[PDB]
Amino acid sequence: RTDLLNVCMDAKHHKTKPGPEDKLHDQCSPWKKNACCTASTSQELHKDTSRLYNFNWDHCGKMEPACKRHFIQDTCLYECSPNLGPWIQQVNQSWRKERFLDVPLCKEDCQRWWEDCHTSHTCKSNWHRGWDWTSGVNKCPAGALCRTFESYFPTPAALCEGLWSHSYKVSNYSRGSGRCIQMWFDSAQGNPNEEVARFYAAAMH
Ligand SMILES: *[C@@H]1O[C@H](CO)[C@@H](O[C@@H]2O[C@H](CO)[C@@H](O[C@@H]3O[C@H](CO)[C@@H](O)[C@H](O)[C@@H]3O)[C@H](O)[C@H]2NC(C)=O)[C@H](O)[C@H]1NC(C)=O
Ligand SMILES: Nc1nc(N)c2nc(CNc3ccc(C(=O)N[C@@H](CCC(=O)O)C(=O)O)cc3)cnc2n1
Ligand SMILES: [Cl-]
Ligand SMILES: [Cl-]
Ligand SMILES: [K+]
């Protein structure tokens, strides 16, 4: 229960423990009061093919800004959230010992993400496994054609749930209900996802 709260997962860049980061860059700044990412990490993850994982979002031509902002926001959450304890799973990968499974993403966040990416393209419905890495950057592998986002993600859930091997599940709860993790939030009344982590930590027990 409580041991799942306010933790950082054992992954490539994560800090060991949550802590204030007043200099979090741009989109990551709402995490500045309590975060699992360093300022350095937040700065780098905004860049195209950043040194974080050498991951290229423009693998099928340039990805539109309206769409890119969501992938950037998603990376901020992955790298900076101290509130995903309840969904942390043990995996034995070379670059992380842990990851998330079935984080209850607010349906609107997923809907908006999916909608904003319609004009963009990709060659894969899962961005976690199957890329051609031989060049040092992910490239479209054999058998993978470039298509519109909707071809590979026919619905919002296909995007949010398929993208990183089910790191998210789409929650039927809405933004501000306190019953789902929000990707996008202002920290006016603090981080809305603490309450959420606290709720499921107990509810999933
Ligand atoms: C996900 O959440 C939404 C609510 O945000 C759920 O929608 C509601 O579903 C019920 C039926 O299961 C709808 O009810 C039918 O509604 C009409 C009234 O408009 C009523 O006359 C019928 O007797 C019947 O109850 C209800 O309208 C709908 N809510 C809204 C605001 O439209 C949905 O069920 C949830 N999904 C799951 C899988 O739980
Ligand atoms: N929940 C969540 N949210 C994110 N934003 C997120 N972003 C990334 C981006 N960083 C990546 C790093 C490595 C790979 C990689 O080496 N893939 C191999 C699999 C084999 C292996 O494991 O080596 C392949 O292509 O076959 C792919 C992506 C990764 N996970 C994420 N998870
Ligand atoms: Cl807008
Ligand atoms: Cl693996
Ligand atoms: K959070």
SS3 readout for 5-58: CCCCCCECCCCCCCECCCCCCHHHHHHCCCECCCHHHHHHCCCCCCCCCCCCCC
Output the CA torsion sign for 87, 197, 110, 60: negative
User: Ligand 2, from 128, 135, 166, 168: best to mutate by most atoms within 8 Å of Cβ?
Assistant: 128
199 Cβ below 6 A of ligand 2 = no
The ligand 2 atom at the shortest distance from the C-alpha of residue 99 is 1
| Both tokens assigned to 183 | 């990707």
What is the Cα 42 distance to its own chain's centre?
13
81 Cβ below 6 A of ligand 2 = no
- Determine the distance separating the centroid of ligand 4 and the alpha carbon of 128, expressed in angstroms: 10
| Both tokens assigned to 192 | 């809305």
User: For residue 156, which of 117, 128, 127 has the smallest C-alpha distance?
Assistant: 117
What residue ranges do the domains of the chain occupy?
Answer: 1-205
**Entry resolution (Å):** 2.3
Look at phi and psi of residue 130 and say left if phi exceeds 0, alpha if psi is from -120 to 50, else beta: left
| Both tokens assigned to 4 | 């799942």
167 Cβ below 6 A of ligand 2 = yes
Burial class, 147, CB count within 10 angstroms (exposed 0-12 / middle 13-18 / buried 19+): middle
78 Cβ below 6 A of ligand 2 = yes
CA angle (173 as vertex; 172, 178 as ends), nearest 5: 155
Q: What angle, 0 to 180 degrees and rounded to 10, lies between the N-to-C axes of helices 65-80 and 107-116?
A: 140
| Both tokens assigned to 46 | 């905004």
Q: What are the backbone angles phi and psi of residue 38, rounded to the nearest 5°?
A: -80, 165
Neighbours of 39 (CB within 10 A): 15
Helix (H, G, I), strand (E, B) or coil at 91: strand
Look at phi and psi of residue 140 and say left if phi exceeds 0, alpha if psi is from -120 to 50, else beta: beta
| Both tokens assigned to 93 | 């990968």
CA dihedral 24, 20, 77, 129 (to 10 degrees): 90
What is the Cα 171 distance to its own chain's centre?
15
Ligand-binding annotation for 127, yes or no, is no
**Contact by Cβ (8 Å): 83, 6:** yes
